[PDB]
Amino acid sequence: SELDQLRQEAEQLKNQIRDARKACADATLSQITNNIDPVGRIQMRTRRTLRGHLAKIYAMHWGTDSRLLVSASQDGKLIIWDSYTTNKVHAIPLRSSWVMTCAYAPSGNYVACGGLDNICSIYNLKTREGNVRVSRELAGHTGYLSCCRFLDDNQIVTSSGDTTCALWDIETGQQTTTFTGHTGDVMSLSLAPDTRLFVSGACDASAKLWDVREGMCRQTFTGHESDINAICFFPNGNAFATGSDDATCRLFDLRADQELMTYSHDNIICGITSVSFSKSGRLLLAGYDDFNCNVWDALKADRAGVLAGHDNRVSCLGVTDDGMAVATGSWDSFLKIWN
């Protein structure tokens, strides 16, 4: 019929993009980085061990003050910890215990949580009555929520398991904009420092760079061999690192529109659950399924240290805004702080 030529013209466009990328790749990042100083061996020890969660932890998020952190486990509790003194600050019971993500508002007045219930619950923390109460319940996603990030106190952005992302309006409770184009479950999203465009990695070996204002996909990046589990922006906002289940990490650059460096090793065969950069964009921390999270020197593509302690796979890994500590939450109901 007439639809047969659609696929062939699409694959000429794909070949054109591929050859343009190949032409624009005159050299490699490894060639430029032959004569740079290696970071060396980074040995970090656990400074604190936050105990009190009953089940496996899936997500955590630091505060903008880099002192208070929210953690979400399968026992049905969202626990807000004071990391400096190990003291607990809040313990919010959740309606649905199957929570896969959590977020902490930049202003600190709100938190968010979502999971298999397909509802993003937004909780107020600075209420007059003192006791925390649910402030909003955003619904409209036909798949499970996998990640959510606060743009500000009024609007949030979430990614669901129905190959969609959504930018909401908390005051009203309606999807302000929707982002479509992925062919698989959108596992993770990362917001740029300017909060003008965010990236989303899905279960099709694809990470898409969107536009919160335009509402249309700006760029698409493939190259991974399997589904991508976690992504994060580079500190400057011009690049992002994607960790997938094919036991490798990849650094994508928006301007170059293609991969720069790949982090992989023969011994590691397990996938990457979480990934986050350091404060200077020189030390990449990635969590694996082999019960520990290797830290990668994300400029020469080699291991520069290994964390330990966790008796199960590490599910979440966050870094403070001032770069003073790294929190790792695994499936042993323990959240360690490293410095």
Binding site: A20, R21, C24, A27, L29, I32, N238, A256, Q258, L260
Partner: peptide, 11 residues
Amino acid sequence: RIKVSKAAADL
């Protein structure tokens, strides 16, 4: 597209 050499020198 920006040249990857420039895309790596900036980083």
